[PDB]
Amino acid sequence: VEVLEVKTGVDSITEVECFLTPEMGDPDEHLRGFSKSISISDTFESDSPNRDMLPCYSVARIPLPNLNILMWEAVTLKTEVIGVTSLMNVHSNGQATHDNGAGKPVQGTSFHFFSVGGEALELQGVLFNYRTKYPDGTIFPKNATVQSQVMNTEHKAYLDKNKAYPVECWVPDPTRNENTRYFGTLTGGENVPPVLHITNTATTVLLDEFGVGPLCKGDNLYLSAVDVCGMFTNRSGSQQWRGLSRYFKVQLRKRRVKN
Amino acid sequence: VEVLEVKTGVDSITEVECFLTPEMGDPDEHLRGFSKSISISDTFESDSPNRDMLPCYSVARIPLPNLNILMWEAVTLKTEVIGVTSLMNVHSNGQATHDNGAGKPVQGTSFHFFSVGGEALELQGVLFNYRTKYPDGTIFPKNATVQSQVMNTEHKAYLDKNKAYPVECWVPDPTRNENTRYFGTLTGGENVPPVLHITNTATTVLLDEFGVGPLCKGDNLYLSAVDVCGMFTNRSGSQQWRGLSRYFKVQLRKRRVK
Amino acid sequence: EVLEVKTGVDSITEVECFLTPEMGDPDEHLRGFSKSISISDTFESDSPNRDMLPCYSVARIPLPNLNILMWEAVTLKTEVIGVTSLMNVHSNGQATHDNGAGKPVQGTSFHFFSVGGEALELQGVLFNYRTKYPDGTIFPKNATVQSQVMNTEHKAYLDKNKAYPVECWVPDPTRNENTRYFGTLTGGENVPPVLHITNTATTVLLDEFGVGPLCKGDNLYLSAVDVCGMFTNRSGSQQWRGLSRYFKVQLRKRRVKN
Amino acid sequence: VEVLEVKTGVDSITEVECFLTPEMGDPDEHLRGFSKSISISDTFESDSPNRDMLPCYSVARIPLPNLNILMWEAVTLKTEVIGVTSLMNVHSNGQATHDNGAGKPVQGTSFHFFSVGGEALELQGVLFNYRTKYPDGTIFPKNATVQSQVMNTEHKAYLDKNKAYPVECWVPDPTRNENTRYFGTLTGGENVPPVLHITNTATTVLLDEFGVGPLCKGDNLYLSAVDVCGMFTNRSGSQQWRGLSRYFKVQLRKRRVKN
Amino acid sequence: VEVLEVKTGVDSITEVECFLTPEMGDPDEHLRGFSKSISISDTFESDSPNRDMLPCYSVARIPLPNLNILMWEAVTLKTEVIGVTSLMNVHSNGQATHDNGAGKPVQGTSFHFFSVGGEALELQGVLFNYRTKYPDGTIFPKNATVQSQVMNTEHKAYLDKNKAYPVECWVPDPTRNENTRYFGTLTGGENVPPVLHITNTATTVLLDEFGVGPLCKGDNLYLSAVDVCGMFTNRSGSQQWRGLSRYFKVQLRKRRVKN
Secondary structure, eight states: OOEEEEEEOOOOOGEEEEOOOBBBBOOTTTTTTTTOOOOOBSSSTTTOOOGGGGGGGGEEEOOOOOOEEEEEOOOOOOOEEEEEGGGOOOOOBBBBSSSTOBBBBBBBBBEEEEEEESSSSSEOOOOOOHHHHHEEEEEEEEOOGGGGGGGTOOOEEEOOSTTBBBGGEEEOOTOOOEEEEEEEEOOOSSOOEEEEEEEEEEEEEOOTTTSSOOBBBGGGEEEEEEEEEEEEBTTSOOOOEEEEEEEEEEEEEEEEOOO | EEEEEESSSSSSSSEEEEEOOOOOOSSHHHTTTOOOOOOHHSTTTOOOOGGGGGGGGGEEEEEOOOOOEEEEEEEEEEEEEOOGGGGGGBBSOOBBBTOOBBBOOBBBBBBEEEEEEOOOOOEHHHSSSTTTTTTTTOOOOOOOOOOGOOOOOOOOOEOOSTTSGGGGGGGTTTTTOOTTEEEEEEESSSSOOOOEEEEEEOEEOOOOSSOOOOBBGGGGGEEEEEEEEEEOOOOTEEEEEEEOOEEEEEEEEEEEEE | OOEEOOOOOOOOEEEEEEEEEOOOOOOOTOOOOOOOOOOBBSSTTTOGGGGGOOBBBBEEEEEOOOOEEOOOEEEEEEEEGGGGGOOOOOOOEEEESOOOOOOOOOOOOOEEEEEEEEEEEEEOSOTTTOOOOOOTOOOOOSOGGGGGOOOOOOOOESTTTTTTTTTTTTEETTTTEEEEEEEEOOOSSOOOOEEESSSSSSSSOTTTTTTTBBBBGGGGEEEEEEEEEEETTTHHHHEEEOOOOEEEEEEEEEEEEO | OEEEEEETTTEEEEEEEEEOBBBBBOTTTTOOBOOOOOOOOOSSOOOOOOOGSSSBBBEEEEOOOOOOOOEEEEEEEEEEEEEEGGGGOOOOOOOSSSOOOOEEEBBBOOEEEEEESSSOOEEOOOSSTTTTTOOOTTTOSSOOOOOGGGTTTOOOOOOSSTTTTTTTTTTEEESTTTTEEEEEEEESSSSSSEEEEEEESSSEEEOOOSSSBBBBBGGEEEEEEEEEEEEEETTTTTEEEEEOOEEEEEEEEEEEEOO | EEEEEOOOOOTTTEEEEEEOOBSOOOOOOTTTTTTTOOOOBBBTOOOOGGGGSBBBOEEEEEOOOOOOOOOEEEEEEEEEEEGGGGGGOOBSOOOOOOOOOOOOOSSSSEEEEEEESSSEEEEEEESSSTOOOOTTTTTTOOOOOGGGGGGGOOOEEESSTTSSSSSSEEEOOOTTTTTEEEEEEEEEESSSSOEEEESSSSOOOOOOSSSOBOOOGGGGEEEEEEEEEEEETOOOOOOOOEEEEEEEEEEEEEEEEEO
């Protein structure tokens, strides 16, 4: 693809605003945005997590105004976590900090990740434990070998399905994603406190070093997200992953391209 | 509504200064700035927080001088939390950290938020637990379903009343607030320590990509805030939200529109 | 009305001094420490003795007398003197654990410094409006429940050393036009002290309009607090430990009218 | 060596992309990416860590296109740790935080290190304890004295062999490496939480203050790495180092050189 | 002294590169770089720390090429801590984290400090406890009074001797050191994790606001360092300061000067 002039004019600019909801497991009809209580396998060879216990990658494919050599180019992203203040509900079935204290807030291992792309995010598989049996209804590395625990190039996938790609198996494939801009932070640890900033005054630019943003094949924008905030501890002491939705505002413009 | 020239002169500039006091619960007439002690429901279904245990958003609507095409445009903000040294009272009915020790100071989950707009801050409701019964005298997401636990578009509101909107079920609506600038931080975890900076040498510019600040409809500036500093632990080991007031200094200039 | 800067001979001056911390000094051997912290059982019975209360430090520095012409503070260099003293973990310290070293000074800290052409101006805010502050100290008077968020009666001048309890007072952001102040409260019980020393860093004291503090009556006001944290003795009791602050201030001569 | 002009033209540039797997010990045929569980010595004299217990430096020598006097010059690096989300597997033979809680995630002492050079990374030896007996199959400071605990200049080597230079015995030698760019953080502490950022938008510049990058002797790129993420605690409470692979992408341009 | 022009020419440039070893106490002939295990006085009046238990400032007077009006002027500094990876030896007489665990790594109170100067570092004395009996063969504030615990102007010295000036009594005197540049962080707390960055791509400029670096009186350069990394806990539970060597590379140039 030869990228050429940006079209000028008011019809040359569009905008995509949406919410991408989390996919944490949802173990009952009252617990959307939570996973199942975590159960620990006794051995590696018996690691067998259920689907309702495994957070997955969120993805939304957004149709843009049809164009046809012109493609929509993603220029600017605005994004934030929606419902940060909900993590102050410290009075609903929380294990106490101590005797007569308030609930433990959501804390621990967090993954905050977001991508904007002209095609599906491209994933590479890395397994904590290759012998883990992943559940029916999820898409995960197949023919896992020991070498899957560090790097196995057989484990390529597209983020082509919502509620399907377990977070713990897949990362953005850094050998691809030319047409995607991705951003991710894992903050590990049992007690790591969530630090969530919100503002409507921060724009991130999506143009590569040559002034070129993601170009939207078949007039589709791809928004992908993960926002595992940490773990909710109930009074029994068992722990659930808790997630929040992510806001996306992408500005786009029309680029001419050849071949 | 198109934005044109900024009126110049010495009669074209105005300044708004004020304090927004925190609204933490005030469970008795000696505990202004504190909440009622947290009680934890045994289940989600039975979660029923009383008003005096629910911190709420602070809001002040300030009349500006009248202009009748001319609107007040907000340009610069100075803000800080007032009384940060108050958190050094570790000698007043606080649980000792160990045998013979000084008092645990205010710590744990904090929310520091401020916003300046030309209209009321626009809110999206999101709930930790959708079956939570919120109390009489508070304004909260109505018709909550399990989708409210992640994203429910029904839950829209304007921060149009003080001591009314509980911090825990409302957040600035990113899909709106085009005529407001907002900034907040949630610092979670039960041990996390307060980090409070203060200076009269720091200025936030309020203008957008296009050099335009909030334009004050009806000649009213709207200041909104939340300064939940953490929890204070009394010798019983029960915990109360403690908040502080926030200072605002806003500089406004005249703008012609339409 | 601020006019031209004078240039040439005797046009420049420097002020270099140290300000000692003011922590309580509870016996002739413990300068720079508070008394051990006693906790009151109730808010009602909170009665901290002067030797348990850290206070604001201040120095009125007299400048070369001028006769329309006044001194203008332009840059600051500052640091905490004797940071390495906090490596003494062998002098009557509660052991971390069995056979271990003494617990270092840690927990709640307040690092503040200001340079002004008049007394730093203070706002009173109280953790607990019922606290009885001791004779010999200057504290918010006629305290009410509203004093726990913002009571405009509590106004004062940092005009005396060892008198203004840190926990009652903050810089008043509605005034202090003729001062630059900077402060950090790092609260928490385990919070580690982080202290940077260098002779390579310079703060600029000029405002947005290129004007620094102007020294009324030819007097520079330096103000400071450096409560580093608490020292735990082998008994478990905790004292505030403070350290001295170094100020270097470059001033120039500014003509002024009316 | 006199560094002259850069050749231009579409064939004057090349790109190196690869993965560097962690060398953590691999104690059995199922635990690639893990160390052997740590065994403490009663005394400094008895300190005798086995090879399967000692994380080593990763190194890849990468042959570039032959030139016959031109040398390849490394200009830009893109790197990230691959599989950061694998550390969310807190349900596989993990010691519980507390009664009913999730597995403890990987946490504790981490070393994150990467270097790009036109020759093997140059190593200085420093020993926590000079009387440690290092194992057959590893290459370590020889003729240790007590001064090896602070600085002994006998302890020089080239990172010229994978799975062999123990990470705790060697460090980049700052008196050499004129022809290498190295970056490393040690975050020690027993409870220290991992912090892993991913993005395809960040580029390191490899040029020195004179606009010259590493020049590749015999047309070879040297990529060195260590990504000890922390330790994994099984249900017995014994602890293994857990390592992850590192992605490199280096842009190189042809430089003319004399002698 | 009037400062005039920089000299130019290949021979107006010189470079000083060297290691500063730590002076932690060296309690026995196997523990270079450790202190003696810490003992706590029952009272202030009885504080009497032994020399093998007190870390001291490190210093090196480096002779420069003899110039006979001309002085060498220090312009740039590269510095790093050497053997940061040595803090991953958690298998050598360390107190376990918990039952079956790896050893506690080095952690707790750290002081990292370095200075480059045209004369000896000037020290101000500050004592935690003015009644402390400092030991024979160390240089300490003398005729100490209670005022010595905050600020006593009597306590002035030159860091003119190695393994002599105990760290806890002395800090750079900020009323002096015009001809030195100093940099120091105290990170206190008992459990504080070491964060140690290494790279050969960072340079510090030693030039003040007027473009003048340290001027080396009598053709001498003064390099001072402290790098107490934290505390080592042996299986006893007793604790020793552990330090590491610091690397210095200083670029100097000739400067004319009058009187």
